[model samples]
Target chain A: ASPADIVKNLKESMAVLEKQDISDKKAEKATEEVSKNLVAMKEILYGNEKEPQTEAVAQLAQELYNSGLLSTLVADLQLIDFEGKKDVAQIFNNILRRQIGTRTPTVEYICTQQNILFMLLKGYESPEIALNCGIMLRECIRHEPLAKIILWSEQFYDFFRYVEMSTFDIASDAFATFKDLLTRHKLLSAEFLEQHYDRFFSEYEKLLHSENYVTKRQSLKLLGELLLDRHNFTIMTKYISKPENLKLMMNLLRDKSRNIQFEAFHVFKVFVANPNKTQPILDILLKNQAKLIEFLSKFQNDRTEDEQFNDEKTYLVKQIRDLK
Target chain B: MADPEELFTKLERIGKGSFGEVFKGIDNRTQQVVAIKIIDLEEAEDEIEDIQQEITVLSQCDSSYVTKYYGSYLKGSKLWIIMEYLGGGSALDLLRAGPFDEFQIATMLKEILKGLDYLHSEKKIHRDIKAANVLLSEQGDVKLAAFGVAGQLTDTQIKRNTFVGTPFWMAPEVIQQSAYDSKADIWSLGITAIELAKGEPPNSDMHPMRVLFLIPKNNPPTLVGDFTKSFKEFIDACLNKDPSFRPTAKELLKHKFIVKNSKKTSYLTELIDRFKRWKAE
Candidate 1:
C-alpha cells in the first residue's frame, strides 16, 4: 500500500480500537496488522519510491500523531522489525525530527530508534546519515521525559562524543536546538541547567573573547536572552561584569563601525536598564563620558546643517544630562 | 498597617482653607509617606461629582515624579486623600524656609517637566499647577501634587466657568475662564520654577482679589536676577500666554536648558535606564 494509505488505515484502525473496550481482541488484532503495514510502507517509501513518497510518508505520520492517535500505535509498532529495515527506519527517524507532535511519542519508541541509529553510526558506512538521525532524536526528545533515558544510554553518549570531536559545527547546532527546546517547553529543571551551565559559560566566553566581531555580537545577544530570567541574572551579571567582558563591550561601543556601535549600545542599554544591579558597570560608562562624547561627535559632524541643528547638538546634550 | 491614629501622629497640620484641611501625613505602608488632604465633600455638595472625577483622574496616573495616589477613602462626611508626602514641603513652604539657589531652581524645573511629560501623556491637565500645589519630598524629589481641581482636558474646558485653581498659578487662559489643556500645566510649571529661584511665589502676600484680577490680564510674573540664560529660555517657552504657542512636553524635554551639554543618544539611554530601574524597584 502507498505510505498515505498506510497512515490512513493505521489511524482509522486506532480510532476503532480506541472507541471499543480495551480488551477487544478483534480490535487489538486489527491495530497490530496496521502497525505491520506501516513498517512495510516505510520500506517501500524509503527504498524504491521517489523522494516525494518519503516526504509524504513523513508528513502523514506526523499529522496522524499530532492528532493524538499515534500514542496507541507506538507500543504495537515497537515489536515490528523496524531496525533491520534500515532505509525504512531512517525515514521513520526523519519524520520524528521534522514532525514534533504536541504530545510526544512514547519514550520506549524513542529509545529503540536511538539504539538502531547508534549501531549504524558505529558501523561507519553512513556516518552522516547516522549523525542526522542522532540530531533528529535529540530534537524530538530534548525536553521530554525521554531525555533522561537517551542521555543515560551508552550508545547516546558514544554518538554525542563522536559528534563533539569530529565537527563543532554540528555540535553547536545540536546544543542550540536542545537549549531552545528546553527553554520553550519550560522543561529545563534547575539541576539540568546547573550541570550544563559551565559548558554554556565556557562557550559564551570563547565567543566574546574571539577576535571576530560578528561572533562576539551574536554570542552576546544569545547570552543576554538566556540570562533574561531572574534565575540566570546573577550569573550573567558576574560574567558580563568581568573586566575582560566589559573591556570588549566598551571597545564595541567605541568601534567606528555604525552597526557595531548600535549593537554595543543596545546591549549596554539592557545592562544599565536592569536596575541598580548593574550600577557599577554603568559607572564605567559614566567615568568615560568624555571619550564617548568625543567619539559620538564625529557622527554628529557628518550630518547636514538642518539635521545637525535638529539632532546632533540636542543628542549630545541629552547624553550629558543622563550621566548626571 | 498603622492605625489612623498612628498615621495622624506623623503628620502636622499644615494649613486649612474654605474647602478643607490639608495635613502632611507619613504613610506607614510605603514608609516614604505623603501629604493627606481631607476635603469635606458634603460642603462641596453640588461639586462632589467633580471631586470624584478628579480622584478618578489621579488614580489612572503612574509616574515617579508626579504626586502618587497612596489611598483614598471617606472619613465621616469628608473625603480623605493620601498623596506622596513632600517633607521639604510645598514651594510656598520652601520660600518660608530660605532663599532658593539657581542650581536648585534648575533642578526643580527639570523635574517639573518630567512630571508634566507623564501627566500630558495621560491627557491630563493639572488645572491648579500653583506654588502651593507643587511639593518637595525630603529626598529632594519634586512632585506635582494636589489635583483636587485637576481634570481631563476635555472635561476641564467645559467646566471652565467654575474657577477652581489657586490664583497665582492660574494661566491667563484659565484665569480668563477660557478652555485649556496640558499647556496650562506648563505655565504653572514656569511660575513654580521662578518661585523656586525667588524663594517665594511671585506676588505672594498680595491681596487675593487683586492677584486674581491681574493674572487674567496676561500680565507676566516678574523673574528675579541670577536666572541663567538657558533657564530663562525654558521659563519663557513655558509661560507663553497663548497655550497653543507653549512648547509641548516632548519638545520641552528636548529643549536646550533641559539637555544642555549632553548627547541625545546617551542622555536618552541614561534616562530610559533610570526610568526602568525606578519602575522595577
Candidate 2:
C-alpha cells in the first residue's frame, strides 16, 4: 500500500495496543501488526537500498502527525517487542530528519506535540526501552527548540540519575544525550546554566564524584568543554571563582585513575586561568602554589608531543607562583 | 545490578587484547556458558566513552551469525562484558594447525558473509574482519566476533574516512584515508579467505606499516596457488581496488564458488578434530 495507507494501519494497531482490556492473544496480534506497519513505514521513509523519495517521505510525515501514530507509538512503546521497538525508533528518527530548506516540518510538528518528546525523555526509566528512546531523543535534541524544551523541563534533571545507573549501556547512552543537550546549542545551554547555575552545578558535581569511572571521567570532560566554550564566559567565570569548585578539581587532579586525573586537569586549568579570582579562590591557589607547581612540572610530562598541553602546564605553574 | 562474581562463575582465561583479558564463564542463574571480558578501565589505553560505544554497538546486534552481547557490569575499576561462548576457537587458531581445504573455507566464508550482510543492512561496518575474528562453535556454527573497530554510518554521514583495521587486511580506500563504506569489510573478507586457504594473509612476512603503503599503491593481491577458477574469481571480485566494483556480502553469496562449494557448517568439524590432533602431537 501507499504511505498514507501504511500509516493508517500503524495508527489502528497503536490504538489497539493502548487498550488496557485487550486479550493477551489479541495484543500479540496487534503488536505484530504494529511491527509490520512500522517496517513498512521505515521502508517508505528510509528505502530498501534505494534512496527514499522526498514526495513519499513528505506525505508520510504529514500522515504520521495527522494520525497521531508517532505519539501513540512513543507512549505505548512498551507493548512492542524488542525488535519492534528498534523499528519504531528508526522510523521516528527518519521522520525527525525531514527538513526542507529553512523549514523543519518534523521539528515544527514536534514543538506543537511536545508529549512525544517528553515520552522519549521518560524512556530512560525503563531499561528495556532506554537505549532505543535515547537514539530517538538525541535526534530531537539536535533541534534547538526541542532541546530547549528538554533542558528547561524538570524531566531534564532525570538525566543526572540516568547517567549514573548501574547498566553501563543505558547510563552511557544517557550521558551522550545529556552532553548533546548541553553542548548542541552553545548559547542556549549557557543561558540555561546562567539561570539555574546553583541547581545545575550541584547535580553535575555528583557526576564528577560518581563511583562509576565512566560517569566521573565523561562528566569531567563535558564540564571542561562547557566551561571553556567562549559562549559560556559568564558561567565559566562564576564556576571558577567558587573555592569549593576549586577544591573539587584539586582533588580530582589527584584521582587514582590516570584518565580521571587527566580530565580533571582540563577543568582545573580554567580555574587557574581566571584572571580576577575571588579572594577565597586566591587563598586556595596560594596555599597549594608550591604543590601545584611541583605537580604541574611532572604531570603527564611525557606528552611531549602535545605542545598546547605543555604550554598550558608551564603557564599554570607561572600563574600559581604569582598568585600571592 | 548484582555483583559480577555472584552472577557468573569465572573459569579459564580465554584470550587477552589491548582492551583486557577475556575469560570463559557460566551464568549462575541460567547456568549457561558465557565469555567474560574483564576490562580494567584504569589501565586501559582507550577511554570509557569509546568502550561504552562499543558495548552499545554490540548490545544492539541480534543475529545468529554474530556473537551475542548478554550484558555489562562494573565492579570496582573493572568492567565485565558478557558474550555468547563459541568453544571451537577462532579460525586463525585452527589455521595454525593447518590451512583449510576448499570445502571448509567455502563453508566458513558463507557464514561470515551472512554476518556481514546483517551488519551492513543495519548500517554498521565490522571494520576488522579476519580469520582471527571468525569464531566457531563446537557444533560447527560460525559467528563473527571482535567489533572493537566497528563503524556505524548514519544517513547524514554515509562514508567514513578514518583509517582503522589490520594493515594486512586493509582495503585500498581505507589505507588511502579516503571516504569508504562497508565495502572495506569485503576487502578484508577476501584477505581472510586467503588466510584460511594459505594459513596466513598475503605479505605476512613484511612489516605491517610497510604493507599499509603497499596495499594502496600496488596491485590487489590474488590467491597464488592452484585454486579452482571459481574460488579465484570470488577472490578477484573481493580484492577489486575500486570499492565500487567490489561485490557486497549479499551479492557474493550468489558467486559460483560459494554456491557450489559451500558445505554444511557441520563439515567444519573436521577442522576442529584436525587442530586437536595436531595440538596433541
TM-scores of all models?
Answer: 0.40, 0.91
Which DockQ-derived CAPRI band holds candidate 1?
incorrect
- Fraction of true interface contacts that also occur in model 1: 0.00
User: Where does candidate 2 chain B have its weakest 10-residue lDDT segment?
Assistant: B154-163
Winning candidate number (lDDT): 2
**For residue A249, what is the lDDT in candidate 2?**
91
Clashing pairs in 2: none
DockQ of each: 0.00, 0.62
Model 1, C-alpha of B125: deviation from truth (Å): 1.4
TM-score of the second chain, each candidate in turn, equals 0.75, 0.91
- RMSD of candidates 1 onward, in order: 30.9, 3.4
TM-score of chain A of 2: 0.92
Per-candidate TM-score, first chain only?
Answer: 0.49, 0.92
